Amino acid sequence: AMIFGFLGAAGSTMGAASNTLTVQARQLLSGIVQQQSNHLLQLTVWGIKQLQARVLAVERYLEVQKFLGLWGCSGKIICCTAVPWNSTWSNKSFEQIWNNMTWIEWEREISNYTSQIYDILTESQFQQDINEVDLL
């Protein structure tokens, strides 16, 4: 077992790739785009490109954080949910997923149901909060 770099475990199966999640997660907002940048210097050809690059980096980070909040997974690397798996998105067994597939192949297999699954996860978290307000 050796530590990997950014996306170094893209070609390994899930069972081995999921042990390097913090490598990809640690590089989502922080980069050299936020440097001091060494005729308005902020209006030059490459002063504008740096600016919109800074805004691009933020939106990409907030696009994922928006869902984590809705699903109740804020502050978690691996977050367990209360949504049962539906054997229409995929019916592969444990060994056919975590020992035979890469994260790229899998996310392509269920690509048709990611939008449907996202809506269910939000609805599930909403029910937990409803069931908690009228239980305490």
Epitope: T13, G15, A16, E95, Q96, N99, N100
Partner: nanobody, 119 residues
Framework: QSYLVQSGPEVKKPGTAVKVSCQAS????????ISWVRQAPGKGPQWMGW????????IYLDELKDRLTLTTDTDTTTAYMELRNLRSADTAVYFC??????????????WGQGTLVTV
């Protein structure tokens, strides 16, 4: 996809050395491990060894530990098995078997047609 083909039969005098090659094609060779088993006539298969075509790591059987060595070739995607000091009881059909999955296979997906060697 994927298919393993072995060589033709051989008739080798006892005491000689025999090498049998299993050729893999139509699939990613390095992803799945390769196993060798021998099935004597009127008997059941016997497990011999398991070779990983990715990093070359090999696993052998004690009785065959000092007699059998497995090597793998990547550029032409061929698996080789050589056996030396051929006892008279080594006559059996030899198979090359592909692993079920890329990790912790617990099963063999595809086999070869077999190579009967007489000693």
């Amino acid at each position: 996809q994927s298919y393993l083909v072995q060589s033709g039969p051989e008739v080798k005098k006892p005491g000689t050395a025999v090498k049998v090659s299993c050729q893999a094609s139509r699939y990613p060779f390095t992803f799945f491990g390769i196993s060798w088993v021998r099935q004597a006539p009127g008997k059941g298969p016997q497990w011999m060894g398991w070779i990983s075509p990715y990093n070359g790591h090999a696993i052998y059987l004690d009785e065959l530990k000092d007699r059998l060595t497995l090597t793998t070739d990547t550029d032409t995607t061929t698996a080789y098995m050589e056996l030396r000091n051929l006892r008279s009881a080594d006559t059996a059909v030899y198979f090359c078997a592909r692993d079920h999955t890329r990790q912790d296979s617990r099963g063999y997906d595809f086999w070869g047609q077999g190579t009967l060697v007489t000693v």
